[PDB]
RNA sequence: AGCCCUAGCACAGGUGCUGCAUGGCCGUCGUCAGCUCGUGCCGUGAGGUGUUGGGUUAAGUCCCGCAACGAGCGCAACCCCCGC
């Protein structure tokens, strides 16, 4: 069930803010805007999903990254609808790269789940009370989907590679293959498996992402509903 | 044997010089909000980033941001005096 779904309103997006590297994956410039060829979207989408399968079934790990308004919450869903880690709030420099050291923050996060419910729940010099228990805040805020990552991922799934270029560059440095939902800002050449689509339309992001998580579960049996994600659409 | 007295021998002694050979301890900028490290990222490189920025503080005090994430010597606190 694809075909026209994307053609809902999730074809073409950005306008003359382009990157001529994307000249291939475009149909026409109607009414001032760029409109992306969907035949080609599919051509790529298969190969891309086919990648997902082959490493999904092998029991891989995809690191999901979306931070635009229009993604964000739709990432902490489908990622968690998959047990797959995600970055949602802000991409920290060296997440893949300085990983060992960024991890030390998770090493130190879950020292607080301990003292969440412990003899240290309503005691200790109680200015420390809030500050320690408001330190977990920064921690829970940024490392929500990141705590699961215990080893470097086998892939990264991105929704805007020119927004998330800092992550991508980290990937490729580590040869971690880059998967991305990407439109006419983004430089294809450094996106390994490409889903030429729409970095912005909240509909588009979901239509694609959710369905890609579907294969991640289909490759381990037990698919469900249209999935807990239909946004505050209006 | 110990120890004392005279003639000898090693050695004692020196507030004699060198703070520009030094230890130690002090003074000083200055109780000023600073000075750095680890890993990553940038740069052929010295280096940079971090520590720049906005709000806030007695304070690099916190906050919000951010290719950085943290850490040490600082600041503050743990000590003493005075107030109930």
From Swiss-Prot:
SUPFAM superfamilies: Ribosomal protein S2
A GO BP entry: translation
Protein name as catalogued: Small ribosomal subunit protein uS2
Record GO terms (molecular function): rRNA binding; structural constituent of ribosome
Alphabetical keyword list: Coiled coil, Ribonucleoprotein, Ribosomal protein, RNA-binding, rRNA-binding
Residue spans crossing the bilayer: none
InterPro entries documented for this protein: Ribosomal_uS2 (IPR001865), Ribosomal_uS2_bac/mit/plastid (IPR005706), Ribosomal_uS2_CS (IPR018130), Ribosomal_uS2_flav_dom_sf (IPR023591)
